[PDB]
């Protein structure tokens, strides 16, 4: 199906407090498998998935040698960006980089991306054609010229369309028990009495993977999303996800309300009804 490999990098300067905090994480779909933290002791790429630890020492040596290069590039970038924006030397600033590739149902390249942000604001991004850049302001345009001169986009295209896809396919094959699975959500409905004339009807979906799911409340068929307390899909901690949607029902109207659960793991959308 659509699968994806993504790498996230965060570099936070700590002025007068030590080296910048560098954190790198790697995801296949909604599953973290690699991590690096400058404040950890290993100073190595650590595994976060059972399918990745069986890689040899060469894999981890290469991953650590590349993540330290990323760390050194981001440390230089912190000062370069502090210079471009004429910011003071005593403020902590954040740099974020996210790059990866999505492959389709045929496990062939579908989309590549490489985004770069400064202080939570878009800075420079690779366009969908993997040839041009989108800059946010004039410092980002300066970077765009520096990167067009160095032919950065061509090397990035070679990586995203080739190496990224190949290693994503390797991961999908080696970790199919967790990566190619579809855990259908376990659903149930709860009913709480907020008063004697009102009640809360909550609809739960637990233990599902991947995280994409739709919970919709309906009253006699009409949509109730404006009066629906929906929470962000949250991790359970075991590689699955949770979600719930609540509605305030007048006491005696519970049979009018139906919860609808749509997930990739469900052959038919589940329709839950209280009473």
């Amino acid at each position: 199906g659509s699968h994806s490999m993504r790498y996230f990098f965060t570099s936070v300067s700590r002025p007068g407090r030590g080296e910048p905090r560098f954190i790198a994480v790697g995801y296949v779909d909604d599953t973290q498998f690699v991590r690096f933290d400058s404040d950890a002791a290993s100073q190595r790429m650590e595994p976060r998935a059972p399918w990745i630890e069986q890689e040899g020492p060469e894999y981890w040596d290469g991953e650590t040698r590349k993540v330290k290069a990323h760390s050194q590039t981001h440390r230089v970038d912190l000062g370069t960006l502090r210079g471009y924006y004429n910011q003071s030397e005593a403020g902590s600033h954040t740099v974020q980089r996210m790059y990866g590739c999505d492959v389709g149902s045929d496990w062939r390249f579908l989309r590549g991306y490489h985004q770069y942000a400064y202080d939570g604001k878009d800075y420079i991004a690779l366009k969908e054609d993997l040839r041009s850049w989108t800059a946010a302001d004039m410092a980002a345009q300066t970077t765009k010229h520096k990167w067009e001169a160095a032919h950065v986009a061509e090397q990035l295209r070679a990586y995203l369309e080739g190496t990224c896809v190949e290693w994503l396919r390797r991961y999908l094959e080696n970790g199919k028990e967790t990566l190619q699975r579809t855990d259908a959500p376990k659903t149930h409905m709860t009913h709480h009495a907020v008063s004697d004339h009102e009640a809360t009807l909550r609809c739960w979906a637990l233990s599902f993977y991947p995280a994409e799911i739709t919970l919709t409340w309906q009253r006699d068929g009409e949509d109730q999303t404006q009066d629906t307390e929906l929470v962000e899909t949250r991790p359970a901690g075991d590689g699955t996800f949770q979600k719930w949607a609540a509605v305030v029902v007048p006491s005696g109207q519970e049979q009018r309300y139906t919860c609808h659960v749509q997930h990739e793991g469900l052959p038919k959308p589940l329709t839950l009804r209280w009473e």
């Binding site: 990323h70 230089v76 970038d77 370069t80 950065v152 990035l156 190496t163």
Partner: peptide, 9 residues
């Protein structure tokens, strides 16, 4: 697998 080459801003 991360990108071997990383250029700077």
């Amino acid at each position: 697998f991360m990108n071997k080459f990383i250029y700077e801003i």
